[PDB]
């Protein structure tokens, strides 16, 4: 079995490279962030522009939904993170304390915590209600490329250009695990599988890898794409077949069979690096966004 993703919509409006696209958990919306310092909301199914969210003083590298789809957090070069109420468009909290660029962000499943990663090599845990830094983790020896909470929020996974992936106890902030394979390429992305059993990690060696982090073992490897420079999001697609989805520096979206590691489809259309892809929570819909020479977001449906 292979999927049949076809292009349905091309969404323009960001005036600079897009950095990140993410579907709201309720399936209604698509949020995008960009080097243009703006967040944009779109209809997840029609790609219809909804609104622009602004306030960051510099470019944004990442945006993420709260579990109830009512809130957004963004990570920006201005060294801040911002909590947005999507309906009012209001900035509720501006989270400060990072010493350098914020690169990545995520709410935990209860959405009372935000985790952030920064060029200041730290991983930070923030309180959603008060907007205060609760814990600063001296996580890595290089910029932190991604941060993610597991299914219940007890664990955080981080990745860095230092070559490591690390698992953190959310409550204590202790490092519970350091994962690295036999080459030490920069880890450009990481995230838990939906069941929290695995961690999918991306490395700047054209390689995506699936780990059982409990066992510290790499189970699967997904190759064929080009990823040697940019921190490209990768995803688990579960709504139809079980796929791995990722952008590529060859201007292409890749789809792999999760079990057999075989490329099952490649999506053509973008004119620059597909920096970000996102998989819809209930439908077989992939969103993809590209870099400076493209600046568009595309919507694909199987």
Swiss-Prot record:
A GO term, aspect molecular function: histone H3K4 methyltransferase activity
Positions annotated as WD repeat: 13-52, 55-96, 98-138, 139-178, 182-223, 226-266, 269-302
Effect of residue 61 to F: Strongly reduced affinity for histone H3
CDD domains: WD40
Protein name: WD repeat-containing protein 5
Superkingdom assignment: Eukaryota
Cross-link (Glycyl lysine isopeptide (Lys-Gly) (interchain with G-Cter in SUMO2)): 16
Effect of residue 103 to L: Strongly reduced affinity for histone H3
Main location: nucleus
GO BP, one annotated term: regulation of embryonic development
Organism: Homo sapiens (Human)
Compartment(s): Nucleus
Residue list for modification N6-acetyllysine: 82
Gene Ontology terms: cellular component: ATAC complex; histone acetyltransferase complex; histone methyltransferase complex; mitotic spindle; MLL1 complex; MLL1/2 complex; MLL3/4 complex; NSL complex
Similarity annotation: Belongs to the WD repeat WDR5/wds family.
Role according to the record: Contributes to histone modification. May position the N-terminus of histone H3 for efficient trimethylation at 'Lys-4'. As part of the MLL1/MLL complex it is involved in methylation and dimethylation at 'Lys-4' of histone H3. H3 'Lys-4' methylation represents a specific tag for epigenetic transcriptional activation. As part of the NSL complex it may be involved in acetylation of nucleosomal histone H4 on several lysine residues. May regulate osteoblasts differentiation.
Sites marked Important for interaction with histone H3: 77, 103, 233, 292
Effect of substituting residue 233 to W: Strongly reduced affinity for histone H3
Effect in UniProt of substituting residue 119 to A: Significant decrease in interaction with KMT2A
Pfam families: Beta-prop_WDR5
Subunit and partners: Interacts with PAXBP1; the interaction is direct and links a WDR5-containing histone methyltransferase complex to PAX7 and PAX3. Interacts with HCFC1. Component of the ATAC complex, a complex with histone acetyltransferase activity on histones H3 and H4. Component of the SET1 complex, at least composed of the catalytic subunit (SETD1A or SETD1B), WDR5, WDR82, RBBP5, ASH2L/ASH2, CXXC1/CFP1, HCFC1 and DPY30. Core component of several methyltransferase-containing complexes including MLL1/MLL, MLL2/3 (also named ASCOM complex) and MLL4/WBP7.
PROSITE patterns, A to Z: WD_REPEATS_1, WD_REPEATS_2, WD_REPEATS_REGION
Resulting phenotype, residue 233 to A: Strongly reduced affinity for histone H3. Significant decrease in interaction with KMT2A
InterPro entries: G-protein_beta_WD-40_rep, WD40/YVTN_repeat-like_dom_sf, WD40_repeat_CS, WD40_repeat_dom_sf, WD40_rpt
Record key words, sorted: Acetylation, Chromatin regulator, Host-virus interaction, Isopeptide bond, Nucleus, Repeat, Transcription, Transcription regulation, Ubl conjugation, WD repeat
């Amino acid at each position: 079995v292979k999927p049949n993703y076809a292009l349905k919509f091309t969404l323009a409006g960001h005036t600079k490279a897009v950095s990140s696209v993410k579907f709201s958990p309720n399936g209604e919306w698509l949020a995008s962030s960009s080097a243009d310092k703006l967040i944009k909301i779109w209809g997840a199914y029609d790609g219809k522009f909804e609104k622009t969210i602004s306030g960051h003083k510099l470019g944004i590298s990442d945006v993420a939904w709260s579990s109830d789809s009512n809130l957004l957090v963004s990570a920006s070069d201005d060294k801040t993170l911002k909590i947005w109420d999507v309906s009012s468009g209001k900035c509720l909290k501006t989270l400060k304390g990072h010493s350098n660029y914020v690169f990545c962000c995520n709410f935990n499943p209860q959405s009372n915590l935000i985790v952030s990663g920064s060029f200041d090599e730290s991983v930070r845990i923030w309180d959603v209600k008060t907007g205060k830094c609760l814990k600063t983790l001296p996580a890595h020896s290089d910029p932190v490329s991604a941060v993610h909470f597991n299914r219940d929020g007890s664990l955080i996974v981080s990745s860095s250009y230092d070559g490591l992936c690390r698992i953190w106890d959310t409550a204590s902030g202790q490092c519970l695990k350091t994962l690295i394979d036999d080459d030490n390429p920069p880890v450009s992305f990481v995230k838990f599988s939906p069941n929290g059993k695995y961690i999918l990690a991306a490395t700047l060696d054209n390689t995506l890898k699936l780990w059982d982090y409990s066992k510290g073992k790499c189970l699967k490897t997904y190759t064929g794409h080009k990823n040697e420079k940019y921190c490209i999001f990768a995803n688990f697609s579960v709504t139809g077949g079980k796929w791995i989805v990722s952008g590529s520096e060859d201007n292409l979206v890749y789809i792999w069979n999760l079990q057999t590691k075989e490329i099952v489809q490649k999506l053509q259309g973008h004119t620059d690096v597909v920096i970000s892809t996102a998989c819809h929570p209930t439908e077989n819909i992939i969103a993809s966004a590209a870099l400076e020479n493209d600046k568009t977001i595309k919507l694909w449906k199987s």
